[PDB]
Design a protein around this ligand. Structure first.
Ligand SMILES: O=c1oc2ccc(F)c(F)c2cc1CO[C@H]1[C@@H](O)[C@@H](CO)O[C@@H](S[C@@H]2O[C@H](CO)[C@H](O)[C@H](n3cc(-c4cc(F)c(F)c(F)c4)nn3)[C@H]2O)[C@@H]1O
Length: 138
């Protein structure tokens, strides 16, 4: 285990074919998880599983620019479960991030922040026991 909140540096930002893998276990009674791919203070890609938003589960994705959240993209397919180990894989592609959880495709999120080579940190927060966070080029 690693202790959250956790910052993974992404030196020189991200690039297509970079596969970022986050392993952990959802806590009991979890309420929220967040991945924040950041360009300085801007959040190029916020990936935010919510376990209880109006008594249902949803994945909220967004971008934050100049400290203002933009338009949300929401996905009801929700592959996480309280108490269970997960693998989130974020595959950087030329026009989008592609997210697969537990080896099943979940969603794609088109790049709003264009300067991929400046998206130099991944923040990991929320109701998890973090196991590892790493990346490789496929
Ligand atoms: O209004 C509606 O009405 C409906 C009605 C019906 C329906 F079907 C709908 F879909 C809707 C949908 C809407 C839209 O909802 C909006 C709107 O209300 C808005 C007003 O300002 O506020 C946000 S909340 C805001 O969203 C951000 C992403 O956009 C971040 O996630 C923030 N955020 C989380 C974290 C964080 C920090 C941590 F440390 C963690 F560990 C962690 F996991 C997360 N930090 N920041 C979050 O605070 C709402 O989602």
């Amino acid at each position: 285990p690693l202790i959250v909140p956790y910052n993974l540096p992404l030196p020189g930002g991200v690039v297509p074919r970079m596969l970022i893998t986050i392993l952990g276990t959802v806590k009991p009674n979890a309420n929220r998880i967040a991945l924040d791919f950041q360009r300085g203070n801007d959040v190029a890609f916020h990936f935010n599983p919510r376990f209880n938003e109006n008594n249902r589960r949803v994945i909220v994705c967004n971008t934050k620019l100049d400290n203002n959240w933009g338009r949300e993209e929401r996905q009801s397919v929700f592959p996480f479960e309280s108490g269970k180990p997960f693998k989130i894989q974020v595959l950087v592609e030329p026009d989008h991030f592609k997210v697969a959880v537990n080896d099943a495709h979940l969603l794609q999120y088109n790049h709003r922040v264009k300067k991929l080579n400046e998206i130099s940190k991944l923040g990991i927060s929320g109701d998890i026991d973090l196991t590892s966070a790493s990346y490789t080029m496929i």
